[PDB]
Nucleic acid binder design. Structure first.
Ligand SMILES: [Zn+2]
Length: 1369
DNA sequence: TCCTATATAATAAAAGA
C-alpha cells in the first residue's frame, strides 16, 4: 500500500571527477572514486588525436537513416563481411571436396587445414563458435525477401571504408576472399554447400518460454576438458598479393594475444582503423580487464560499443572468452615448479647429501588453476559450505529471486532506438543494486529475525535472466517452530483484489503458475497442466509435520481470477512473501526447510560450472541432397553472464570464511620449496613455524590464550609470517576446522584426540605430561587422561571364537578387527589368549604339545599378510615382531614356458592377433607412445588373453603387474590388487592430484622394471585417475613420453554403466569419461568382438544390440522404446518364479545362484523382507551403535542420536539388521581381497550367535571356505552429508534382491528383472540382461505406467524404456 | 528425484573500522 514504496535506483546523475561517467548513486564506493569506470585516476587516454565517429554509420545505427532498419537486422553479417581476419572451424566435407571458406550463422569461417604448417606438424585446436540461438528466422532468411542488405547499403559502406581505413590497402576484406574461394571451387566443379547449427534443448527453462529474442540472441559454444574457455583458437589473416614480391604468403596465423586483434575482427565498431581507440591508447601497460572496463561504460559522448545492436552482444560474449583464457594461461605459465618434503627428511638428506648428485627430492605438487569452475575450487567451496551447516545447525529459510526485464529502472534509462535485449550492461548493473538491497534487509535490518549465517549463489538460465538462490540459518531465539510464525513469513493464496490491488497484480503476472512436474514441466504440450494444474492440493492447514519431509502450506479452495482467458484457483500460487514482493516487483519464492535431509538435496546448487548444452553441425549440398551430421557436447555462455564476469561482480558469498589448522608429528612439519633454490630451504627451515608449533609459542607468552582450545584459536587470532597476533578489527568470524586422521599411523591418531580435549600446552612435552608425570608415548598419555574408547565389545568377540574351537578363523578374525575396527589395546588380547591362537601350528610342527621355536612366529606371519595389503605393520599394533620371510613369485621358469605354449594354441584367430601385437611392442626399442585399449563385449574373451600374456612374459624372465578397478575383478586376475592401492592415488581425485608413492621407494622400483601394466576395468576409471598414472610413470622413468613409454593394456567395455557422479546431466557426464581426456589420442584400439557363448548364440547377439541402442523396431511408437521377447514377460509374482515356489534351509544351496534385480533401492528393501518371512527360522535382531566424529561437543546436540539411527546412506549397513539361518548376505567392505572376501562375496548363513556370524562363500576363489565375520566400523562413502557417521555393525546386508548397479560383476544362473518405473542411466537395462548367459533364464515383469507397459492400447505386448548415450560408445 | 567403484589424507601470494 502507501507504506511500501518500490526501490528506486535514483537515476544516472552522479559522475566521477577523474573521467565523465554516469553511475547510479548507490554504486558509489565509500572513498568517492568509482573503481570500474576509470580505476580511480589510474586509467587515462594517451595523447593521440581521436577521430570523430563517421556520420553515415552513426545515422544508420540510430533510426534516423532510411535504410536503418535493414542495417540493424543484418549488423552481424555486414561486420563480418568487412572484417580483415577469420576464425577456423572443423567440418566434414561431402564428396571429399569443399570450398576454402564456408558461412555459418552470418560469420565467415574457414575449414581447419586450409593453411598447412611450414613445420609440417599441426597443433590440435579446440572449437569455439558464436551461435545466433534464435535461428527460427532461418525460414524467412532462406526466402529471398531482402536478406541481402539491399545491395546499395553494402556499396555505400564499402566506399566509406576504403576512404577512411588505412588497413584496407595492407589486408583484403573477407567479402573479396570468399568470392575467390567460390571461384576456385566452381572451376573444379565442387558443389556449393550450406552449414547449419542446431541445439538440442535442455529441460530447464522459464515455463512456456525459451530462446526469447528479448532474453538473449548471441552465445559462445566452446568444448574443453575442465570447462575452462580455450586459449588456443585458429585466427587466419588473408593478405593482399604484392606484384613486387611473390615471397609474401597469402595466409598467416595470429594467436589470441595479437595486439590489434579487436580492430581487425570487428570493423564497424572501430571504423577509422588502427587509430584512436582501435590502437593501444589506454595509458598508465593496462590489463585486459581494465581496457574492457573503460569501453563498456555509459558517457555523454556517442559510444559505438554499447549502441550497435546485435554486434554489442557478440563483442561482450567474445571478449569474456578471450579475457578468461588469457588470464588462466598467463598465471599457469608464470608458476615456479614446487616440491613438498618433511623437515626431518630434508635435514637427513642434507646431512647425507651426495656431492654432485642430481636426484628429485620429495613429491611434486601442482597449484590450483584460477578459474572457479575447475574441480578443485568447487570441492573447497562445498566443504566450506558444509561446515557452516554443521556448526550452526539445520537451515530454516530458502529464498530465490529472478530478474524482471520490464522493471522501471531498466526501461527509463534506455534511449528510444536501443532495445532491452541489445544492451546487456543495464540488466547486470540494475540486478546487482537490487540484490544488495534485499540482502541488506534480511541481515542488516534483521528481517525474518536475527540471521547468523548466509550462503548465496547466482546462476544464469538459458534465457539469460539472472537468478540468485539464498539460504539463511536463523539464530535459536527466532527459529520457526510454530504454525503462527510460518504463516506470517510465507503465504500460498491469491490476495483479496479490493484489500491489496497492487499485490494482486504482482502475484497475477509474476507468480501465477508453476510448471506441472509430470516428466517435462516447462513444455506447454500439457497446456491444462501448465497453468493451475500441479502437485499442490488444498491441505487447508500449515501442517509443518514433514509428512514427505517437505512442509505443505495453507491453501484454501474457492478463490480464483481470470488470466489469459483461463481461471487459475488457489491450487497453484507459488509461496510468496508480501513485503518483499511489494518492494521489489519480481518473483520472490520463500519456502521453509524442516528436514536436515532436505538440505542434503538443496546443497548441490553450488556445484555447477557453465550451462551445458548439446550442439549438432550439419553440412548440406544444394546440387544433391547429401547431409553429414556430427555431435558435439559443449558448455554455453550467454551475453548477460559475460558482462557480469567482465566487471568485478561476485557469484558466490559466504558469511563465515574457514581457516584450516594442521596436525603434525613432533619432528615432521611441511616445507614447500622451489626446485632450483634448494640451498635457500636449509636456512628458511629453522624460521618456518606450522600452526601447531605457533600455538605453543602463543601459550608461552600470553595469559589470555590459555582459556581457548586449539580448534577455537583461529576465531580470536590471525596468522601472518609464522606468528599469531590478536584481531581487533571485528573482522568476519572465521570458523576454524581440524582435519580427520586415519588409524594407519597410530601416534598421529592419538595426537588428534589430545589436541581436541587439552588446552594451554607450553610445548609438545606438556601435551604428553598428565598430572605432573610425563609419559613416553602419546597413546599412554591419552589413556591416563581417560579420553579413549572402551574395548569391551572386542574382548567378547575374541572369547566367542575360542569357544568355537576353529583356530585358523580366529587368527583371521583378529586381523580384520585390528585393521578396520580400531582396537585401543590389541597387545593385551594377544598375550592373554596366545595358546588358543597358535594351537594348530603347535600340533603339526612339534607333534602333541612339543616344545620348539618359531611356532608363534609362523602364526604372527599369517596375520601379517592381511596387515601388509592394507599397509599397516605388526609393530604399529605393539604385537611381538619377527623379521619377514622372503619368497619368489616367478618360481619355475620351465613350468611357465610350457603352460604358455599350450595356451597359445587354443587362442581364437582375433585373440591370437592381439597377442602378436602386444608381444611385438615389448621387443621394439623405439621410444614412441605405446598404449593399447582392448575393446569388445564384456565377457570370457578378455580374461583369457590376460592369462596367456602373463605366462609368456614370466617365461622370458620379465615381470607383469596386473591390477583392476574393482575388488571382485581383482580376485579373478592372478595377484590382483585394486589400482587405487597399487599407485596410491588420492580418494577425492581432483584435477591437481599426484600419487603419494615415493620415487625412491621399493614399490617404485617394481613398477620401473615391469614390462607390462594391465587395468581390468577402464570403464570405471575416471579421466583424472588415468592422468595421475601418467604423471607417476613419467616421473619414475627419465622419459617425458606419455605413460613413460611402457606397454599398457586398459581393456574395458563402454556399454556398461559409467562411473556415478554426485550431480550431472548427459552433457556434464560424457566430458569426465576417458573419451574426452587429452591422452586418449595416443591410444590405439585393438578389437576383440568375436563372441564366445557356450549356448544360445542368438541371445548373445541380442544383448549386443540392446547395449548399442540398435533396436529401433518400436522407436516409431516413442523415442528409446524397445519390446521384450514374449516368452520372458511374466504377469505372475516375480519372487515365486525367480527363487522357486519352495524356499527352505534344506534346499537353500540349490537356489543359491538365483537373484532378483530392481532399479531403485526402496523397492529392493521391501522385496528382501517378504522372502525372509517365508524362510523357516527364528529372527535375530542385531542393533548398532552410531556416533558422529566431531571437533565440537555442542555439534552433537544439533544432530541427535535419534536422527542418526533413521538415516541409511548408500554403502552402509542398516541400523536394525534382521537375519535368519539360511539367508543370503553380501559383504559391504573389501576386507582381504586376495583371499576371496570382496565387495560382493555373497554368503549363505550357517550359524548365528551374538557378536559372531558364520558363513560359507558362494562366489569367488574361496568357493566354500567357512569364514567368521566380526563387527567392523563403517563410515559413509559420499561426502554429501554434513556429518561423518561412524556406525559399528556386522558389514552385511540381506542379498536376495540387489539393485542393478550393485550387480555389475556378479554372475547369476537365473535372474528376474522387476521394473516398477523405467530405467534412468547409461547402461542400466544392458547390465541386468547380461548376467544370464541364455535367453530362457531371464524373466521380466513390468508395472503399467505412463511411459512403460502396453503402450499400444489394442496390442497385448509390453514395452519398456532402454536408455543409451550414443556419444560415449 | 533416482544409482554408488575406490576407502587415505588435504597448496606458494597484501590490506583497511
Ligand atoms: Zn571515472
Amino acid at each position: 500500500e502507501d507504506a511500501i514504496l518500490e526501490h528506486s535506483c535514483g537515476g544516472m546523475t552522479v559522475r566521477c571527477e577523474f573521467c565523465l561517467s554516469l553511475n547510479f548513486s548507490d554504486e558509489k564506493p565509500s572513498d568517492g572514486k568509482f573503481t570500474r569506470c576509470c580505476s580511480k585516476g589510474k586509467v587515462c587516454p594517451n595523447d593521440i588525436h581521436f577521430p570523430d565517429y563517421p556520420a553515415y554509420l552513426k545515422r544508420l545505427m540510430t533510426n534516423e537513416d532510411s535504410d536503418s532498419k535493414n542495417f540493424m537486422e543484418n549488423i552481424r553479417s555486414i561486420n563480418s563481411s568487412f572484417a580483415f581476419a577469420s576464425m577456423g572451424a572443423n567440418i566434414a566435407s561431402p564428396s571429399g571436396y569443399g570450398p576454402y571458406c564456408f558461412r555459418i550463422h552470418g560469420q565467415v569461417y574457414h575449414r581447419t587445414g586450409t593453411l598447412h604448417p611450414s613445420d609440417g606438424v599441426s597443433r590440435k585446436f579446440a572449437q569455439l563458435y558464436i551461435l545466433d540461438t534464435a535461428e527460427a528466422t532461418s525460414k524467412r532468411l532462406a526466402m529471398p525477401e531482402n536478406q541481402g542488405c539491399s545491395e546499395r547499403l553494402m556499396i555505400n559502406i564499402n566506399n566509406l571504408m576504403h576512404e577512411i581505413n588505412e588497413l584496407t590497402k595492407s589486408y583484403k576484406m573477407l567479402h573479396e576472399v570468399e568470392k575467390e574461394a567460390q571461384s576456385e571451387a566452381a572451376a573444379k566443379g565442387i558443389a556449393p554447400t550450406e552449414v547449419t547449427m542446431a541445439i538440442k534443448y535442455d529441460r530447464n527453462s522459464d515455463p512456456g518460454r525459451y530462446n526469447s529474442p528479448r532474453v538473449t540472441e548471441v552465445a559462445v559454444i566452446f568444448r574443453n576438458e575442465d570447462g575452462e574457455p580455450p586459449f588456443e583458437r585458429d585466427l587466419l589473416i588473408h593478405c593482399k598479393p604484392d606484384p613486387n614480391n611473390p615471397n609474401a604468403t597469402k595466409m598467416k596465423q595470429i594467436s589470441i594475444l595479437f595486439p590489434t586483434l579487436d580492430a581487425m575482427t570487428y570493423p564497424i565498431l572501430f571504423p577509422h582503423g588502427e587509430k584512436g581507440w582501435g590502437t593501444d591508447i589506454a595509458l598508465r601497460r593496462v590489463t585486459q580487464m581494465q581496457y574492457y572496463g573503460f569501453h563498456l561504460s555509459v558517457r555523454d559522448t556517442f559510444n559505438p560499443i554499447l549502441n550497435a545492436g546485435k554486434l554489442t552482444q557478440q563483442f561482450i560474449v567474445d571478449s569474456y572468452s578471450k579475457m578468461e583464457a588469457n588470464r588462466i594461461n598467463f598465471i599457469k605459465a608464470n608458476q615456479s615448479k614446487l616440491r613438498v618434503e618433511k623437515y626431518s627428511g630434508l635435514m637427513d638428506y642434507l646431512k647425507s647429501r651426495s656431492e654432485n648428485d642430481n636426484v628429485p627430492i620429495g613429491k611434486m605438487i601442482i597449484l590450483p588453476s584460477s578459474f572457479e569452475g575447475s574441480p578443485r575450487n568447487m570441492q573447497q567451496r562445498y566443504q566450506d559450505a558444509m561446515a557452516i551447516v554443521t556448526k550452526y545447525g539445520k537451515p530454516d529459510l530458502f529464498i530465490t529471486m529472478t530478474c524482471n526485464p520490464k522493471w522501471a529502472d531498466i526501461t527509463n534509462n534506455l534511449q528510444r532506438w536501443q532495445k532491452v535485449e541489445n544492451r546487456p550492461d543495464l540488466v547486470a548493473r540494475v540486478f546487482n543494486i537490487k540484490l544488495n538491497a534485499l540482502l541488506n534487509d534480511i541481515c542488516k535490518f534483521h528481517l525474518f529475525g536475527k540471521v547468523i549465517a548466509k550462503i548465496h549463489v547466482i546462476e544464469f538460465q538459458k534465457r539469460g535472466l539472472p537468478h540468485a538462490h539464498i539460504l539463511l540459518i536463523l539464530d535459536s531465539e527466532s527459529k520457526l517452530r510454530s504454525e503462527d510464525d510460518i504463516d506470517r513469513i510465507v503465504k500460498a493464496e491469491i490476495p483479496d483484489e479490493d484489500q491489496c490491488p497492487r499485490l494482486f497484480q504482482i502475484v497475477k503476472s509474476n507468480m501465477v503458475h508453476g510448471p506441472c512436474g509430470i516428466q517435462n514441466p516447462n513444455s506447454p504440450c500439457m497446456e491444462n497442466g501448465k497453468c493451475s494444474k500441479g502437485y499442490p492440493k488444498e491441505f487447508q492447514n500449515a501442517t509443518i509435520g514433514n509428512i514427505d519431509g517437505y512442509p505443505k502450506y495453507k491453501r484454501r479452495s474457492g478463490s480464483t481470477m481470470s488470466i489469459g482467458n483461463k481461471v487459475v484457483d488457489n491450487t497453484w500460487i507459488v509461496p510468496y512473501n508480501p513485503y518483499l514482493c511489494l518492494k521489489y516487483n519480481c518473483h520472490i519464492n520463500v519456502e521453509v526447510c524442516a528436514s536436515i535431509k532436505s538440505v542434503k538435496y538443496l546443497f548441490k546448487y553450488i556445484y555447477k560450472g557453465h550451462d551445458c548444452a548439446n550442439i549438432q553441425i550439419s553440412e548440406k549440398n544444394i546440387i544433391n541432397h547429401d547431409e553429414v551430421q556430427d555431435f558435439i557436447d559443449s558448455r554455453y555462455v550467454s551475453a548477460p553472464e559475460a558482462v557480469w564476469r567482465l566487471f568485478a561482480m561476485r557469484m558466490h558469498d559466504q558469511s563465515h570464511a574457514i581457516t584450516r589448522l594442521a596436525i603434525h608429528l613432533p619432528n615432521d612439519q611441511n616445507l614447500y620449496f622451489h626446485t632450483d633454490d634448494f640451498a635457500e630451504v636449509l636456512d628458511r627451515a629453522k624460521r618456518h613455524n606450522s600452526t601447531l608449533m605457533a600455538w605453543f609459542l602463543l601459550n608461552r607468552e600470553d595469559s589470555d590464550a590459555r582459556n581457548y582450545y586449539y580448534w577455537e584459536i583461529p576465531q580470536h587470532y590471525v596468522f601472518n609470517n609464522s606468528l599469531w597476533t590478536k584481531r581487533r578489527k571485528g573482522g568476519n568470524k572465521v570458523l576454524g576446522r581440524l582435519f580427520t586422521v586415519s588409524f594407519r599411523e597410530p601416534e598421529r591418531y592419538y595426537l588428534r584426540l589430545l589436541l581436541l580435549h587439552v588446552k594451554g600446552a607450553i610445548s609438545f612435552e606438556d601435551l604428553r605430561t598428565v598430572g605432573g608425570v610425563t609419559y613416553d608415548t602419546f597413546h599412554e598419555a591419552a589413556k591416563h587422561r581417560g579420553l579413549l574408547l572402551d574395548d569391551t565389545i572386542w574382548k567378547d568377540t575374541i572369547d566367542d571364537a575360542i569357544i568355537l574351537n576353529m583356530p585358523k578363523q580366529l587368527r583371521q578374525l583378529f586381523a580384520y578387527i585390528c585393521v578396520f575396527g580400531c582396537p585401543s589395546a590389541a597387545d593385551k588380547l594377544w598375550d592373554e589368549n596366545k595358546s588358543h591362537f597358535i594351537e594348530d601350528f603347535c600340533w603339526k610342527l612339534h607333534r602333541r604339545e612339543g616344545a620348539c621355536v618359531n611356532c608363534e612366529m609362523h602364526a604372527l606371519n599369517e596375520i601379517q599378510e592381511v596387515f601388509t595389503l592394507h599397509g599397516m605393520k605388526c609393530s604399529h599394533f605393539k604385537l611381538p615382531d619377527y623379521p619377514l620371510l622372503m619368497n619368489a613369485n616367478t618360481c619355475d621358469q620351465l613350468y611357465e614356458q610350457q603352460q604358455a605354449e599350450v595356451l597359445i594354441n587354443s587362442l581364437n584367430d582375433e585373440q591370437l592377433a592381439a597377442f602378436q601385437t602386444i608381444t611385438s611392442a615389448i621387443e621394439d626399442q623405439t621410444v614412441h607412445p605405446k598404449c593399447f585399449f582392448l575393446d569388445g563385449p564384456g565377457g570370457s574373451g578378455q580374461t583369457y588373453l590376460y592369462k596367456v600374456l602373463t605366462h609368456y612374459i614370466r617365461g622370458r624372465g620379465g615381470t607383469v603387474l596386473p591390477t583392476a578397478s574393482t575388488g571382485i575383478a581383482a580376485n579373478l586376475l592372478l595377484g590382483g590388487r585394486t589400482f587405487h592401492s597399487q599407485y596410491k592415488l588420492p580418494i577425492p581425485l581432483n584435477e591437481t592430484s599426484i600419487s603419494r608413492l615415493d620415487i625412491k621407494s621399493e614399490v617404485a622400483k617394481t613398477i620401473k622394471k615391469a614390462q607390462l601394466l594391465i587395468i581390468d576395468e577402464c570403464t570405471m576409471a575416471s579421466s583424472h585417475a588415468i592422468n595421475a598414472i601418467d604423471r607417476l610413470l613419467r616421473e619414475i622413468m627419465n622419459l617425458n613420453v606419455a605413460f613413460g613409454g611402457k606397454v599398457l593394456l586398459l581393456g574395458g567395455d563402454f556399454r556398461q554403466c559409467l562411473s556415478i557422479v554426485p550431480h550431472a546431466m548427459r552433457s556434464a557426464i560424457v566430458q569426465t569419461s576417458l573419451k574426452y581426456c587429452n591422452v586418449w589420442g595416443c591410444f590405439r584400439k585393438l578389437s576383440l568382438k568375436t563372441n564366445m557363448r557356450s549356448e544360445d548364440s542368438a541371445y548373445s547377439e541380442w544383448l549386443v544390440k540392446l547395449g548399442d541402442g540398435k533396436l529401433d523396431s518400436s522407436f516409431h511408437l516413442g523415442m528409446d522404446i524397445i519390446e521384450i521377447p514374449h516368452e520372458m514377460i511374466c504377469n505372475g509374482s516375480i519372487i515365486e518364479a525367480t527363487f522357486g515356489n519352495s524356499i527352505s534351509i534344506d534346499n537353500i544351496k540349490n537356489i543359491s545362484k538365483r537373484a532378483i534385480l530392481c532399479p531403485k533401492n526402496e523397492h529392493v528393501q521391501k522385496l528382501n523382507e517378504e522372502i525372509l518371512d517365508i524362510l523357516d527360522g527364528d529372527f535375530h535382531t542385531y542393533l548398532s551403535d552410531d556416533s558422529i566424529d566431531s571437533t565440537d561437543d555442542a555439534e552433537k546436540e544439533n544432530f541427535p542420536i535419534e536422527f542418526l539411527n533413521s538415516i541409511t546412506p548408500s554403502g552402509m549397513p542398516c541400523h536394525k539388521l534382521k537375519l535368519k539361518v539360511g539367508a543370503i548376505i553380501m559383504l559391504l567392505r573389501n576386507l582381504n581381497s586376495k583371499w576371496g572376501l570382496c565387495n560382493g562375496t555373497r554368503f549363505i548363513i550357517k550359524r548365528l550367535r551374538p557378536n559372531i556370524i558364520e558363513a560359507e562363500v558362494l562366489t569367488g576363489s574361496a568357493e566354500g571356505e567357512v569364514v567368521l565375520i566380526p563387527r567392523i566400523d563403517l563410515s559413509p562413502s559420499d561426502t554429501g552429508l554434513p556429518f561423518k557417521l561412524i556406525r559399528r555393525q556386522f558389514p552385511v546386508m540381506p542379498a536376495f534382491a540387489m539393485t542393478i548397479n550393485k550387480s555389475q560383476g556378479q554372475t547369476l544362473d537365473r535372474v528376474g528383472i522387476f521394473l516398477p518405473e523405467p530405467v534412468f542411466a547409461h547402461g542400466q537395462l544392458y547390465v541386468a540382461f547380461s548376467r544370464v548367459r541364455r535367453a530362457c533364464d531371464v524373466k521380466v515383469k513390468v508395472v503399467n505406467t505412463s511411459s512403460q507397459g502396453k503402450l499400444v492400447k489394442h496390442s497385448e505386448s509390453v514395452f519398456t524404456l532402454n536408455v543409451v548415450y550414443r556419444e560415449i560408445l
